[PDB]
Every structure is written in C-alpha cells, then in structure tokens.
C-alpha cells in the first residue's frame, strides 16, 4: 500500500494571528 | 446563538466548502460585535478562497482570451461574481469590522484587509470605474501603513504584511516596480537588524514572512 | 448555439469551475440531438467532478463526525451535503434515462452511458439510508451488468470504455456488494484480456486504456 510520496508567481500573505 | 456558527464554520473549512464557510463568518460578524482573533482569522481564510478561486478561473480564462467572444463573456460572468464578492467583504468591513477596531493591530489587518479587497477589483478594474477603485485601495493601505509604522516594531507579522501585499500594488496594479522594490527592502532591511530580539517562535513568524518580501524581490531583479 | 456550449464547456473545464462545465454540457444533452465522443467526455467529466466534490467534503464529516453534541452539528452537516449530493445524481440519472441512453446509437455509446448509470446509483448507496440502500443497491448492478454484458459482446478487451466499465463495476462488488472474491475475479478477467491484447497493439496509442489496466492490478495487488 503506497501513500507515500511521488509525482513562478508573486507572493501575498494574510496575517492569521495568535 | 454565535458559538455554534464558528464551530459550524470551521466544519465547512475542513469540508473545503469555503462558500458555507463565508457565509457562516458573515453571520458571526453582522452581530456588531467586534471579532476574536479566531473569529477573525476563520473570516479572512473563508473569504479568501471565495475570491481567490475567482481570481484563479479569472487569470486562466483572460489569458485564453488573449491567445473569442465567447471567452470574453466567460472572463465577464467570472468577473461579476468577484466584484459582488469584493463589495460583500468591502461593506462588512465599512459597516461592521473597522469601525469596532479598537486596536492598532485590528485597525492596521482590517485597513490592510480594505486594501486588499480593493486590490483585488484593481486586478479586474477595466475602463473609467478602475481610477476610481485605485484610489481607494491606496488610501486604505496607505492609511494602515501609516498607524503600523508608530504602533509596530520592524519584524511584528502584521506590519510585515502589510509591506509585502503593498508593495505587490505597487509593483501590479500602479506599475512601479521602483516603489515596490523600494518598500519591500524597506520593510525587510529593517527586519534583520532588528533580529536580535526575537524570541524563536516571534522568529518564526517573522522570518516566513520576510521570506515572502525576499522571494518577490528575488523575482523582481 | 449548441457549440458554443461546448466552447463554453471547455472553457469551465480549464477555470476548474465544474459545475457551469455540467451546466453547459446539460443544457447540450437537452438539446435532444445525441453527443459526440468529445461531448459525453466533457459531460462526464464535468459531473464526476461535481459530484466528487461532495463527495470528498462527504467523506471528510463523516471522518470527524465520530464523537457529544459536536457529533449532532457534524450529522446536520453531513445531511447537508448528502442532499447537495443526491440532487446532483438524480439530475444525471434523469438525462439518462430520459436523454443519453434513449438516443444512444454505438454499443459504445451505450456501454458508456450505462456506466455512468451504475457510477451515479452507485454514489446513491454511498450515503443511503437502510430502507433505500439495498434497492438503490440494485439499479446501479443492473445498470453495469447490462452495460457490461453488451462490452463483452461488441467491444474489444483494450477499449478504455469496457476497461473502465470492469473497474468500476468491480469496485461495485468490492465495497457496495462486499463481494472480494466476485470483485477481484472481474477485475484479473478484465485486466488479463486487456494484456494479453495489448501486447498485440503499439500501446503509445493507448494511453488511456494502459491507465484504467493500472487502476485494475492496483486493486489485485490489494485484495490479494
Ligand atoms: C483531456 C480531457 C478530456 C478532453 C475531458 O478527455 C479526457 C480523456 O477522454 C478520453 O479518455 C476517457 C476518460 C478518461 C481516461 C482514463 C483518461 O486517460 C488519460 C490518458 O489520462 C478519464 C475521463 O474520465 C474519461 C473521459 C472517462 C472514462 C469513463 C467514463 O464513463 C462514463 C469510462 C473510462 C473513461 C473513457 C471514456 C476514456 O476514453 C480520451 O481517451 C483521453 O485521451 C487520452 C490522452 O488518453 C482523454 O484524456
């Protein structure tokens, strides 16, 4: 049973605060 | 009451069911009462990915329109959706979010929040309504840069942000890449001086974000 | 008017907006002319994504919705979805039966129009209650067992349409029917026919049919 790994732009954030 | 629809919410997040979501935080929000930093946060991701999977269909359907009527009208029907989307979050803010802020820190991410939804029209601004909605989305950032630059110090998250997305404006939708360039090093120079401070976990916060105003940048030069 | 439609469909397709895609390709079914290859791709397409969305939210309630009173608010949510969902298939099952498979003319045709009625009765069960289950249940079995007669009869072992045919039907068996034996004797059928035809064939050209026999050993190799 394989779940296992395989397989340009600007960045913006939003400010998820504590 | 109000405790269920948050709980009710977040179901809809991790049901990836981001309309349901929105709706539920517009709800938890036309209550007048101010929002919880949860509260708050559960808002911002709802309606981010309500606009932001308009934006997406928007940028890949424009850029088949350039390479045909009938991709122009898709662009349009995309468009209004992002524009009633836009105008949901815009009175939300204006009726119920900005005016309960009290402080600094809410009043900064909810100006920055009005700066970016107008920004986010800007992306869609076609013909005379563009000038106009420029303008708003400036003076929004504008102002909440200007009440984050007396409250917060050089690495706090929010301010950071701030740099990052109002340069992004600059550079996309004014087309300055000087002033945006110019600001993001602003922002980020400042940042690494003060770096001595940082509590690892402050430091964590801060240096993904200064990653992100590098990363433009990297790609700006 | 219709190709427009199609265009239009197209177009959805690429901005990951699946249902206007369905809603094009619906209102191209109600045109009453029967599809093209191309348009009942599209048409499946578009639906399978539709309702897979539900589906994977569905899944994920479910997954949490596992305890006290939190587990009541999960429930009216799964509900919620649950009636998003069947609407979605009771709207493809009706231009089916009303539209699709009236007018299908190839055995190709309605080998693949067939498939899709067991697929979307087969999410019917996913999510039915006791009283409906085992007769919705039913539907879907008849729907594959008369397209997957009519596949053996006129369609080679390699068409990606009896393949997927095979696949599904035997997922059917597997995790509706609880049948493994059953479920994995249709599927090592269906997979060592297509083989053996297909070391006939250049496979370059079969790209999708190689795929769906992918799909098939992958569920062999776990079930054995
Ligand atoms: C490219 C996307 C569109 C245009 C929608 O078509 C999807 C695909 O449409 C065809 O493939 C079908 C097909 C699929 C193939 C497995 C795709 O294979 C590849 C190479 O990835 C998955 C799609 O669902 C589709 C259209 C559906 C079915 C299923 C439908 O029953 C109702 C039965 C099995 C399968 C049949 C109908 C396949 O023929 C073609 O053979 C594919 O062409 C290639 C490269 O193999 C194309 O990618």
Redesign the interface.
Known sequence: ?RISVISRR????????? | DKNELVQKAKLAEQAERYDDMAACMKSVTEQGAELS?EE??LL??AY?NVVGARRSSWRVVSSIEQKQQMAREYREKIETELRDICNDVLSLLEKFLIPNASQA?SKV?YL?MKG?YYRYLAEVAAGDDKKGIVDQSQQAYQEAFEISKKEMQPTH??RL?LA??FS?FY??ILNSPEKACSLAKTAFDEAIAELDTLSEESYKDSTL?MQ?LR??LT??T
């Open positions: 049973p600007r960045q913006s954030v939003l400010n998820l605060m504590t | 930093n708050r946060n911002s991701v981010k820190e991410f920055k970016d998250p929010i942000g990052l997305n992004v550079y996309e974000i992100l990363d433009n790609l700006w």
